[model samples]
Every structure is written in structure tokens, then in C-alpha cells.
Target: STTPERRVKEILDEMDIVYFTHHVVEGWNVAFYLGKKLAIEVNGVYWASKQKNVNKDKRKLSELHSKGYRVLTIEDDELNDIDKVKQQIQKFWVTHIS
Candidate 1:
């Protein structure tokens, strides 16, 4: 049972997220690295997200939302509702993501 990021990434990747050059980077370091590299091909996603200010069990959804990152969260509690999860991911990306 994933906390959040792994679950969200899995759902999104299944729906539409394609890897350009995927690598495992913990925390926001990957995003920061991409920003530093000035690389546009890479996309950053996370699992087990922690809060921005507190860095402890911060909902991935909340961090992404506050920073204007389009994120779709799938909690472990949602393991039962696969169809609903699919719809939510599709809807979130299609409507909210830039």
C-alpha cells in the first residue's frame, strides 16, 4: 500500500505519463535538478510525499496544489475503487493540468 506519490505516479503513467528519461530521485530534488539542468524533456513525480513546510506526511496533493503543480492523488484507502481512480486521474489531467 503506497502512501501517495507511488500510487499517483502509477495511475498517471498508466493513463498518459510517458517517460523521456525516468530516474529515481527522492523528494523535490528531481524537480530541482530538472530546473537546474534546464531540461524540458524530463518530468518529475514523487511517491511518499511530505509537506513543503513540515516535511512530514504532507499530502502529495497538497504540495502540488500549493505550488501550482497539477497532481492527482491516489491514497491507499482507494485500493478498492479502481474505476473511480481511473476516472479521477483522467479528469484531473484533462481539466486541471496545463
Candidate 2:
């Protein structure tokens, strides 16, 4: 079965967006689809079930933000509507492009 990350990758690929999967930033390994200044994170609910994971993720995002990187977190449930994902990514690019 294709996971949410892979599915998101397909959306990015179809759009001809250049990205690096599993890209590292700020000493953390994430950014499932790391574009120029946008970091897309495909997160499963299970990972946030524990407080530690939540805290870690929060710190990771905060650090990324501090580094001027915009984050787009795609929850597992949101994957059901792939169009929404594509739209969100497109919107992100549109809004972030200076």
C-alpha cells in the first residue's frame, strides 16, 4: 500500500515540483518533500500520540521556522482528498513566492 508520503510525492511529481525527500534541516530529518523554502511534512497521527513526539515535532517546526523555512504539514486523514493536497501545495507556492 502506498503511504501518505509517497502519495504526496506523486502530487508533487505530477506538478513538476523539484523536491528532496527525507531532507535534513536544522539537525532534524524530515521535510518529506523539501522544496526551495518550503518543507512538506507527511505526518501520521500515531507519531503524535505521545507527548515526546509532539514536543519533538514542535521543536523541529520551530527550528525550521527560525531558519526561514515554511512548513506544510499534511496529516494522514487529509490524504483521502489528494486534490486538496495539490491545491494546498500550489497555494503555498503562490503565497510564498516573493
Candidate 3:
């Protein structure tokens, strides 16, 4: 079984989207895949359930939004369906890419 992060990386690679892995922004290791104006975050189930993690994630997302990045979060459960994930990412790309 591929990890969630690995799956996202595979999707990005297959889509031929230019991205930086583990990109740092404003002193935060923000995105798993950072595109020109998009930030893709692969969220595991455990981390998302915690209040602390949620708070930090909110702050990080706020910061990214403030910097003009459209954030796309792919949860662990979502990774179970690769086709859906691909479609979702493609949709985001279509809508967000200028």
C-alpha cells in the first residue's frame, strides 16, 4: 500500500504539474506539493483529529491564503480512490490555474 503522501506525489507527477516538495513558506514547512499559486496538503487521519493539529493547520492555511495560494487538502480517506483524487486535483488545476 502506498502512503498518502506518495500517492499525492504520484498524482502530481502524472499530471506533469510543476511543484516543490516540502516547500517552506513563512518559516513553516507548509505544503507537500507547492505549485506556482497552489498548495497541496496531504493530511493523515490522526493528525487531523487533534485540536492542536487543526489549529496549526488553520494558521498555516490562513498564511498560505494570505500569500495568495489556493490550498487543496487531500485527506487519507480520499487517497483510497485514486481516480477521484486525480479528478479533484485536475478540477483544482482547471479552476485555479491562470
Candidate 4:
């Protein structure tokens, strides 16, 4: 069974997105640069500790505003549903890629 992270990567690959995984943007997970006009962090779960992961991920998202990028987090619970993940990614583009 492929994991959520792998599935996310597959979707991104198919979309031809340029991104960095586990990229350290002041301790964030993923950042996508779809050529100027948009820089974003799209994050997910850390399987070990749910509460701690949530807290850490929240901090990571908040930090991006200071660094000049809109951010979205696809929570651990949400990752299993590929359609929802796609929707959230699309939502970010609709909201930020104008």
C-alpha cells in the first residue's frame, strides 16, 4: 500500500509541479514554486504524534506569511482522500495564484 506522502508526490509529479520535500522553510514540510506569482507550503501529517504534529505544522504555516508565501495544510486525516487533496491544492491556486 502506498502511503499518503507517496500519493501526494504522484499527483504533484503528474501535474508537473516543481517542489521540495521536507524543505526547511524555518522547519516546514513542502514548498511549491509554480513559477513566480505563487510560492506555497503544502503540508501533511507526521505519523508518530498527532497533537505534536498538529502544533508544529500550525507554526510552520504561520511562519510562511512572514516569508512571503500563502500556505495550506492538508491534515493527516484528510490525506487519504485524493480528491479532497486535489481540491485543497486547487483552492490554494484559486485563492493565491491570481
Candidate 5:
């Protein structure tokens, strides 16, 4: 089975994007810093069943947001809908660039 994280990486790779995985930037998943524009978090994970995991994720996302990295949560459930994921990525490119 293709894990959500792996699947997202594949999509990013197909798009010819340069990104780093688990690279520490406050709290990181995938970091795509393509110049001063469009540095986004294409985060992939399973939504936590536990409250602790949920709370930690929430806080981390909040911190990253405050520092100016917009996040797209690619939950495990959404991995099957890869076309939608691609659209999300494209949408980010469209919206972030002037």
C-alpha cells in the first residue's frame, strides 16, 4: 500500500518540484522553497485518533502558519483522490504567485 506521505512525494516528484522531507522548520513535513514565492507545506499524515497527537499537530500547524507557511493537510483518507491532490498543488502555485 502506498502511504500518504510516499504518495505525496511521488506527486511532487512527478511535478518536478524540489522539496525536502521531514526537514525541521519549526515542525516540517515537506518543504518546497522555490525562491521567495510559494513556500508551502504539502503535509501528509493520518489524522490522529488520539487527542495528544491531535493537539500536538494543531499546535505545530499554528506555529508554522504564524511564521508564514500555508499548509495543505493531505490526510491519509485523501491519498486515493490524487487528482484532487494535484489540483490542490496547482492551486497553491496559482494563488501564491503574483
Candidate 6:
């Protein structure tokens, strides 16, 4: 599946997600669309909702960073093989992630 939402949509096509609409205008960006999500900060509000969960992701990200994950947002992009990602996690977390 390309996205969780796609899976959710497939499974729950009988009832769709309730969405509210609002129009947004960006000045001097001709290609900018109205009410478009141009970018996404991974693990947003849920991370903000609880500091503990936020720490969980932070620690994971930090561990990945130390393991050479670097400034790459490839978790759902270029990344392949859970074992490879786990290897990086193990190098950082279980190995003190340094």
C-alpha cells in the first residue's frame, strides 16, 4: 500500500473520513494550490500530544542519526528492508546509539 490512509480507505470505503474544507491562498506562488498539504512534519501532533511518545520517536531518530541515518527522510521513501533499518536502530539504541 502506498499509504495507511489508502489502506484505511480501502477497508472503510463504506464510510469515508469526515473532512472539513477551508480555502487558503498563498501570495506570489502561482503553482500553490488552495488547501493543499505541501509538506509533512513526520509524526506530528501525536508526538506533541504526549512528551513520552515524542521522546520515543526522538530517541529513535537520534539513534538512527548516530547510526548514519543522517538528514535523510527515507523512512517511507528510499528505505527498503526492515532488517536494514533495524540494523541501524540496533547500532544506535541497543548499542547505546552512539
| By TM-score: ranked, best first | 2, 3, 5, 4, 1, 6
Estimate the overall C-alpha local distance difference test score of candidate 4. Answer: 0.61
* Clash count, predicted structure 5: 0
lDDT of each: 0.42, 0.79, 0.78, 0.61, 0.63, 0.31
Tens-place lDDT per residue, model 5, 1-98, is 87566787788789887775655665455445543323445444434552336676778778777877666666566657789889987787667654
Ranking by lDDT: 2, 3, 5, 4, 1, 6
TM-score of 3: 0.81
lDDT of 6 at 17: 21
lDDT of 2 by residue, 15-80 (tens): 777788898776777646456667788776675453445778778888888888888998888989
Q: Candidate 4: how large is its RMSD?
A: 3.4
Q: How accurate is candidate 2 locally (lDDT)?
A: 0.79
Better of 3 and 5 by TM-score: 3
**Per-residue lDDT for 8-85 in model 3, tens only?**
888888988878888876666745655576778877667645444578887888887888877888888988878999
Q: What is the lDDT of residue 55 in candidate 2?
A: 78
TM-score versus the correct structure, for each prediction: 0.42, 0.84, 0.81, 0.64, 0.70, 0.25
lDDT head-to-head 2 vs 3, winner: 2
Per-residue lDDT tens digits for candidate 4, residues 1-98, read: 87556666676787666676655554554645554434444444455543444676567556767777566655556766778888777777667764
Better of 2 and 3 by TM-score: 2
- What's the lDDT for residue 68 in model 2? 88
lDDT of 1 by residue, 17-87 (tens): 54323332333322111221211111224335533353433554355446654433345556457677678
Best candidate, TM-score: 2
Alpha carbon lDDT at 32, candidate 3: 61
Q: Is candidate 1 or 2 superior in TM-score?
A: 2
